[PDB]
Amino acid sequence: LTLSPNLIGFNSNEGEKLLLTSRSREDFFPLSMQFVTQVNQAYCGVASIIMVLNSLGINAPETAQYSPYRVFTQDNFFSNEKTKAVIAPEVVARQGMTLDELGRLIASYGVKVKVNHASDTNIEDFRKQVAENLKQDGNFVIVNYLRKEIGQERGGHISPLAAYNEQTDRFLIMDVSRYKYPPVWVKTTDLWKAMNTVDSVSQKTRGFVFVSKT
Amino acid sequence: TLSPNLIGFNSNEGEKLLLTSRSREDFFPLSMQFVTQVNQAYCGVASIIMVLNSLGINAPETAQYSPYRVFTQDNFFSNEKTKAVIAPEVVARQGMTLDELGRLIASYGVKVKVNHASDTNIEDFRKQVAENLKQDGNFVIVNYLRKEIGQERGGHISPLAAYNEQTDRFLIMDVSRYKYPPVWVKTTDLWKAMNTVDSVSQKTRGFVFVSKT
Ligand SMILES: [Ca+2]
Ligand SMILES: [Ca+2]
Ligand SMILES: [Ca+2]
Ligand SMILES: [Ca+2]
Ligand SMILES: [Ca+2]
């Protein structure tokens, strides 16, 4: 779809160079290797989770799909009974997942998670802590934001962050709606504004999640 | 588990080879479309749809992503001419040969040049691919025997993303993402892998250039 003017698409010369001039891009290469297309909009969070968990090398489900190889897929993510217990795949397939549910679904695989609702932090701490993470291997960041607030269509979305460009104060979103939008470089204030919104399903603000190996 | 001759993209070295590469135009669009093969037999399908999506070729219209249109492994064979080249059920078992790969891409009105290893040479391959990897609007797919580059094991298909001039290595965007990462393979190893006879076709493997007519 059309990109709002305040967004710099990754599918451009300027978007490519913002990655090349970024000094906070460690997470991009592992995430790029795992980039997937959401099964549907509702599975925006499942696609983002398996990107991060595969990037972490989390020992994955053993199913007949790719046996003997082990890997997270949107098809086998809910093979974990505790994952289904958080929220069933039939339900996620309809309404997606909240930020809290996103954190718990990840924690149900033994992975360590830190959920940061926008209302519980600020933009300065968001920029600092996420930029630090994007310089570090072995951990990742997933964001949950209102697309409308960054000039996109339209509702709440979930997608990992891959890099941060210090010159432009922009974060790279690896948008799993690959049939709809490309990865975009978004200004920190725009992304903060979209995270500082209330998810009607949650009645809580959206935000960002830090994921790492326990 | 990669053999010593291969430099994995999941490495500091593999990342530098991309950052130090002057032949990497195709990586960024291909990265945006990177997909995991449904199964080994579909390595070619995952490869085709990566390239067709990158070229912006108008994609099938199906309920899955409607109104949006995109090439997926599940809908690639919605095209009757595509299915006429070789049926999805047969491709689901035995995959596709180099000739079938080209014809399958051509089934979508896309310009294709099939290059069998027996019809060219390593020098022209290195030369012609390195130049393609420096331009947009076209892409390279290779068909090769994994055994010859130190991998397991049979014939495989995947696109190329970049060429590292200083090491004479090509980066394979391996769509067997659960099995291997993208690898920087030396031109000598890749050619020897392409210069192998596929018993299904009784012809050598090779590479295909893809562009919009
Ligand atoms: Ca690193
Ligand atoms: Ca990180
Ligand atoms: Ca929602
Ligand atoms: Ca370009
Ligand atoms: Ca090219």
Side-chain angles (χ1 to χ4, degrees), chain A residues 1-212 214, chain B residues 2-12 14-185 187-211 213:
Chain A
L1 300 172
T2 293
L3 284 201
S4 168
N6 63 341
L7 296 168
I8 286 174
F10 187 68
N11 54 343
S12 67
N13 297 321
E14 321 94 64
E16 288 173 1
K17 188 84 85 62
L18 286 190
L19 178 69
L20 292 172
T21 54
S22 164
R23 309 190 296 287
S24 300
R25 61 180 179 203
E26 282 277 69
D27 293 354
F28 166 87
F29 300 99
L31 287 174
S32 81
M33 283 175 54
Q34 305 299 338
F35 208 13
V36 289
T37 296
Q38 64 197 20
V39 164
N40 53 26
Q41 182 53 46
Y43 261 39
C44 68
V46 181
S48 307
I49 289 168
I50 68 111
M51 280 182 62
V52 159
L53 300 186
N54 282 330
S55 295
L56 276 170
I58 310 300
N59 312 291
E62 315 188 352
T63 77
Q65 173 173 59
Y66 294 128
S67 171
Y69 308 96
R70 306 175 58 201
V71 64
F72 290 87
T73 72
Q74 296 175 75
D75 281 19
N76 74 16
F77 177 67
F78 290 95
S79 63
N80 177 342
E81 299 283 11
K82 320 163 265 171
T83 309
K84 285 209 290 198
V86 174
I87 180 163
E90 298 85 3
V91 173
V92 178
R94 289 168 175 184
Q95 62 175 246
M97 63 185 65
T98 61
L99 178 72
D100 281 343
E101 291 167 351
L102 166 65
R104 293 169 51 207
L105 287 167
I106 300 168
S108 77
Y109 267 96
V111 176
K112 192 206 211 176
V113 180
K114 167 54 181 149
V115 179
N116 283 291
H117 285 270
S119 56
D120 294 322
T121 186
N122 52 80
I123 185 174
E124 288 87 11
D125 284 347
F126 163 71
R127 180 190 286 103
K128 176 190 259 194
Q129 296 174 8
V130 169
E132 182 182 46
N133 179 305
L134 298 169
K135 287 185 192 62
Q136 288 170 331
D137 294 311
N139 54 33
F140 299 94
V141 190
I142 299 168
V143 287
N144 163 226
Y145 56 97
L146 192 62
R147 259 165 173 160
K148 172 171 46 154
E149 291 302 335
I150 69 169
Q152 292 190 313
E153 304 290 322
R154 193 181 129 89
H157 190 48
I158 298 169
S159 275
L161 299 183
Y164 168 73
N165 189 271
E166 295 83 357
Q167 212 185 252
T168 66
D169 187 21
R170 282 170 187 274
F171 288 99
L172 179 59
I173 303 175
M174 301 294 286
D175 197 334
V176 290
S177 307
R178 307 203 285 184
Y179 55 88
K180 175 182 200 172
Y181 286 118
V184 292
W185 290 92
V186 55
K187 286 280 201 178
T188 302
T189 58
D190 289 336
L191 179 49
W192 176 256
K193 182 155 192 89
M195 288 186 295
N196 194 24
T197 60
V198 170
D199 181 349
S200 35
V201 179
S202 82
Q203 310 187 337
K204 282 167 146 203
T205 51
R206 302 183 167 85
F208 53 103
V209 181
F210 290 128
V211 183
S212 50
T214 315
Chain B
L2 290 167
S3 50
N5 62 302
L6 299 169
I7 287 173
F9 186 75
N10 56 338
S11 70
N12 263 117
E15 293 178 6
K16 301 327 281 295
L17 298 183
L18 179 70
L19 294 167
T20 60
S21 166
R22 295 187 292 100
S23 294
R24 57 169 191 218
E25 292 304 308
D26 292 1
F27 166 86
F28 304 95
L30 285 172
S31 84
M32 284 172 52
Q33 307 297 337
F34 208 16
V35 289
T36 300
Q37 64 194 25
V38 158
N39 61 12
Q40 180 50 51
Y42 259 44
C43 62
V45 187
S47 294
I48 293 163
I49 63 102
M50 280 181 61
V51 162
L52 295 191
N53 282 332
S54 293
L55 286 167
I57 306 313
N58 313 107
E61 267 170 39
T62 62
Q64 166 166 39
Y65 293 131
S66 171
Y68 308 104
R69 300 172 55 196
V70 49
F71 283 94
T72 74
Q73 288 174 84
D74 174 70
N75 74 17
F76 175 79
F77 282 102
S78 62
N79 177 345
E80 298 286 5
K81 292 173 154 193
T82 306
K83 168 191 262 239
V85 177
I86 183 173
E89 315 91 37
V90 175
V91 174
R93 298 178 170 177
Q94 53 175 87
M96 68 191 64
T97 61
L98 182 64
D99 278 338
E100 290 165 347
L101 157 71
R103 297 166 57 203
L104 284 162
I105 294 159
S107 77
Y108 272 96
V110 177
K111 184 184 204 75
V112 292
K113 171 58 188 140
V114 178
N115 282 307
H116 288 271
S118 51
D119 291 323
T120 187
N121 52 86
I122 188 166
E123 287 85 26
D124 287 335
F125 159 69
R126 186 194 285 106
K127 209 179 292 164
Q128 293 161 214
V129 173
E131 200 47 47
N132 183 299
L133 300 175
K134 287 196 192 63
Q135 333 183 70
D136 305 305
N138 50 38
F139 297 91
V140 189
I141 300 167
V142 285
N143 171 224
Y144 60 96
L145 191 65
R146 261 168 174 156
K147 193 207 318 195
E148 292 299 339
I149 71 169
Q151 289 182 331
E152 306 301 317
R153 183 165 182 294
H156 191 51
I157 300 172
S158 275
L160 298 182
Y163 172 66
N164 183 265
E165 311 86 0
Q166 214 264 18
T167 62
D168 188 39
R169 276 178 197 270
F170 284 100
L171 178 62
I172 300 174
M173 296 304 266
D174 191 336
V175 294
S176 300
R177 303 202 288 184
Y178 54 85
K179 190 172 177 183
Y180 286 116
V183 284
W184 288 96
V185 52
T187 302
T188 37
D189 289 331
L190 183 42
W191 172 261
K192 180 68 218 82
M194 289 185 300
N195 198 15
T196 62
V197 176
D198 183 354
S199 76
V200 169
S201 66
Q202 304 179 3
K203 286 154 80 149
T204 53
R205 298 182 169 88
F207 53 106
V208 187
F209 289 120
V210 195
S211 48
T213 296

